[PDB]
Structure formats: C-alpha cells, structure tokens
Design a protein around this ligand. Structure first.
Ligand SMILES: *[C@@H]1O[C@H](CO)[C@@H](O)[C@H](O)[C@H]1NC(C)=O
Length: 300
C-alpha cells in the first residue's frame, strides 16, 4: 500500500504517523456540506500484487482536527456514508494492482447555521484519520494515522447557503453620495432566507452606523444602508424571498446620513455585519459577512 498526494508528494509507507498536505474546495450541498474530497488528493497502489493483496479500512475515532473539531458530519468511504467522527468500522478498500487508484474518501459537515462559515488557514490541521492495513495471507495488521493539513486558505460553509464574499469593502463618492454593495447569496436547495445588519449605530432610529474612522474623521455623519431607497435599520430581518441555487443579490447600497449638527470635513468609516437567518429561525452565531464602508467629507 503506497500512496502519494495530487502534488506528487509521497506519503511515508509503513510510518505510524504522517502529515498529509492537501487542497480543499468546500461547498454547500443538499443536506450536508463538503469539507474536502480526498479522492482528488490522495492516490494509492499495491507495489507487489502477485505476492500480497492489501486491505485498508478507516477506523473508529477518525475525526476533524483544530477549528473543525466541534462539528459533526459524515465521511463517504468507498461509496458508503458513515457518521464522522467515526463510531463504526468501514469496509475494506482492496489494493490488488500497481495502477494508482484514488483513496475513495470525502469528509462532510452537518449544516447547523443558515450561511455561516469557518475560516481554515493554510497549514492548519483539518482531520486526524486512523487507518488499519491487513492482507490476504496472514493475520499481520498495522494501525496508523494520517493527519490531514490544509494546503490553502479556505472558508468551510456551516449552513445551507453560501455568499459571494465574506468581506466586502466599498468606497462611497465624496459626501453626499451612494455606492452599490456587491453581495449575493445562494442556497443548495430553495430556502426562505432573510438577513439582518449589525454594528454600532448613532441615531435613535438605529439605522445610521457610527463613523469609527480613527484618523482625521468627519463629524456629524454616519453610514446608512438602503435597498432601492428603502432604509435598512440594524437588527431587523429583511426577507429575500425564496433563495435557491441561482445567486440572489441582497440589493444593498451604502450612503452617508446625518447624525446631528454640521457635517464637517474628514474620513468616514463604518464596519457593518450581515447575518443570514431562515424564516422563523434563530439569530445564532456572529456575522456571516463584514462590509467596510469608506467615505470622505471634503471641505469646500
Ligand atoms: C435585536 O432584536 C432582538 C429582538 O427584539 C433582541 O432580542 C436583541 O436584544 C436585539 N439586539 C440589539 C443589539 O438591539
């Protein structure tokens, strides 16, 4: 049983522990989300098929590591789906040829939110998989571990929906003026989706985000979000209707809005969160998207 990664790196044969660096492409799917499809990342063969037939199983206790360790999901192992972390034995994968074959494994996460995400940095541990190798001629076995590490920066979705970006920055024209906010959402299947804004507001109406610019800021002005002129206050669910596989724009626009007194020259900045919720669902977790709105009041 000899394996290698898609990037050509050999996995130490017969080692009790190995660190395997792999690329992940997480995605929302119906009922569960893909974290990493290892069948496109790990390829294995038998160097001596005439003298031995290799059998490899995934063992109980295989689980996500690091920032994913509190999430439950499933593992698809050679066509069969199991709870992950693993509590059951898996069928054997037979290696009876010198021709490379993908290691038929994909790791999934059970959706818990509407459009939440978990950032995975490159070089971080994503899973600790326990393998057991046997053969067809004697009772010798070998139990070893593959520590799966991320090659790339990725965001693993934790809900039924995903966004065009997790962080969006827009620049308003000089006061007064408006700018569209490019931000869309889609769901693996049709969801009655909504969202709400969060941040710090300056007004009684809870609809003008405070200017938090630290250097030479303006006074008397904040940032207000609109949807075709309609004003969106903070902490107020806005329905998007039914959102399916085709991306739906939130239709948001940033504007300046007065907070009292003269609007004076300087920088304007507001950091606004966007959190998605299903119709009649709880407002769990933090912001799904962070919008940074920059602006400037210029003295005449
Ligand atoms: C948002 O609204 C909900 C419902 O009234 C309330 O429980 C929560 O405290 C509000 N949060 C803020 C920051 O106003």
């Amino acid at each position: 049983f000899a394996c290698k990664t898609a990037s050509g790196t050999a996995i130490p044969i017969g080692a009790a522990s190995a660190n395997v660096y792999v690329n992940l492409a997480p995605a929302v799917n119906v009922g569960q989300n893909l974290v990493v499809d290892l069948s496109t990342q790990i390829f294995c063969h038998n160097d001596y098929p005439e003298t031995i037939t290799d059998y490899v199983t995934l063992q109980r206790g295989s689980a996500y590591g690091g920032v994913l360790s509190s999430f439950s999901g499933t593992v698809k192992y050679s066509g069969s789906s199991y709870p992950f972390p693993t509590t059951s034995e898996t069928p054997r994968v037979v290696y009876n040829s010198r021709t490379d074959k993908p290691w038929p494994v994909a790791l999934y996460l059970t959706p818990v939110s509407s459009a939440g995400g978990v950032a995975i940095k490159a070089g971080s541990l994503i899973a600790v998989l326990i393998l057991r190798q046997t053969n067809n001629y004697n009772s010798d076995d070998f139990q070893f571990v593959w520590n799966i590490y991320a090659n790339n920066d990725v965001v693993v979705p934790t809900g039924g929906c995903d966004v065009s970006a997790r962080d969006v920055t827009v620049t308003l024209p000089d006061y007064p003026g408006s700018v569209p906010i490019p931000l869309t959402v889609y769901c693996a299947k049709s969801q009655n989706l909504g969202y709400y804004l969060s941040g710090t507001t300056a007004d009684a109406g809870n609809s003008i985000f405070t200017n938090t610019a630290s250097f030479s800021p303006a006074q008397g002005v904040g940032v207000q979000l609109t949807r075709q002129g309609t004003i969106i206050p903070a902490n107020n669910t806005v329905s998007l209707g039914a959102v399916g596989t085709s991306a739906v724009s939130l239709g948001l626009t940033a504007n300046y809005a007065r907070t009292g007194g003269q609007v004076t020259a300087g920088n304007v900045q507001s950091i606004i969160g966007v959190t998605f919720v299903y119709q009649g669902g709880s407002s769990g977790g933090g912001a799904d998207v962070t919008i940074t709105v920059n602006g400037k009041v210029v003295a005449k």
